[PDB]
């Protein structure tokens, strides 16, 4: 029997959250790189602006990943419950 074993861990809403935030990670990574490495004189205010936007986009992608991990474990919960009937 399955004993103490449980289901192995391997949306449109999340999908668009991901693509907007990912584009923004590309956008701000580029703009921080340009403004810290390809300019004669570094405009710190500009860098600060894009660092805010950069962290916002990185953390949005993190929030999506964590929500997908939560969703996956919720589905695993259903499957683990269904699987009790195999006993």
């Amino acid at each position: 029997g399955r004993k103490l074993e449980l289901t192995k861990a391997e949306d449109t809403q999340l999908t668009k959250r991901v693509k907007n935030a990912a584009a923004n990670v590309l956008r701000e990574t580029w703009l921080i790189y340009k403004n810290t490495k390809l300019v004669k004189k570094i405009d710190h205010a500009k860098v600060r602006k894009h660092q805010r936007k950069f962290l916002q986009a990185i953390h949005q992608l993190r929030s999506v990943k964590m929500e997908q991990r939560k969703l996956n474990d919720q589905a695993n919960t259903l499957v683990d419950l269904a699987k009790t009937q195999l006993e």
Binding site: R2, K3, L4, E5, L6, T7, K8, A9, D11, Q13, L14, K70, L71, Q74, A75, N76, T77, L78, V79, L81, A82, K83, T84, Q85, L86
Partner: protein, 146 residues
């Protein structure tokens, strides 16, 4: 990820754990109820996402054949040794790898659903391998999962 005849009938018993009114369909509302009976708290969007993940005909509810695709895709199981160890470690006050028999009794007779002092007798009898009144929970969990 292909299934058998005995499992189909068994997963049919499973479907009834979810289809609380028996109309042959599982709604977000029914899924909420079940998930909450398992001490979880999915939001509305989470419930819809779980349905949406396996809703072929896209009619907003899970039917029995959609229920079996969820299952086929996920039959693989995994050993729970490490996670169970981490649950014991919650009660390892000094993080020394041990929980005394007295502390285990305290935990088990007061927290969660609880065991009776007698059930705890049997549990400690198995857990206290060395008879030193201390439970090496890593070793104990490995015995129960072997």
């Amino acid at each position: 990820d292909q299934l058998t005849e005995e499992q189909i009938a068994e997963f049919k018993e499973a479907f009834s754990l979810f289809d609380k009114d028996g109309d042959g369909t599982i709604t977000t509302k029914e899924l909420g109820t079940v998930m909450r009976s398992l001490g979880q708290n999915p939001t509305e969007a989470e419930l819809q996402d779980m349905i949406n993940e396996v809703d072929a005909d896209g009619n907003g509810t899970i039917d029995f054949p959609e229920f079996l695709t969820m299952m086929a895709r996920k039959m693989k199981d995994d050993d729970s040794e490490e996670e169970i160890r981490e649950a014991f470690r919650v009660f390892d006050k000094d993080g020394n790898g041990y929980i005394s028999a007295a502390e285990l009794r305290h935990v088990m007779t007061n927290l969660g659903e609880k065991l009776t002092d007698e059930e705890v007798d049997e549990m400690i009898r198995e857990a206290d391998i060395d008879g030193d009144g201390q439970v090496n929970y890593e070793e104990f969990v490995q015995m129960m999962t072997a």
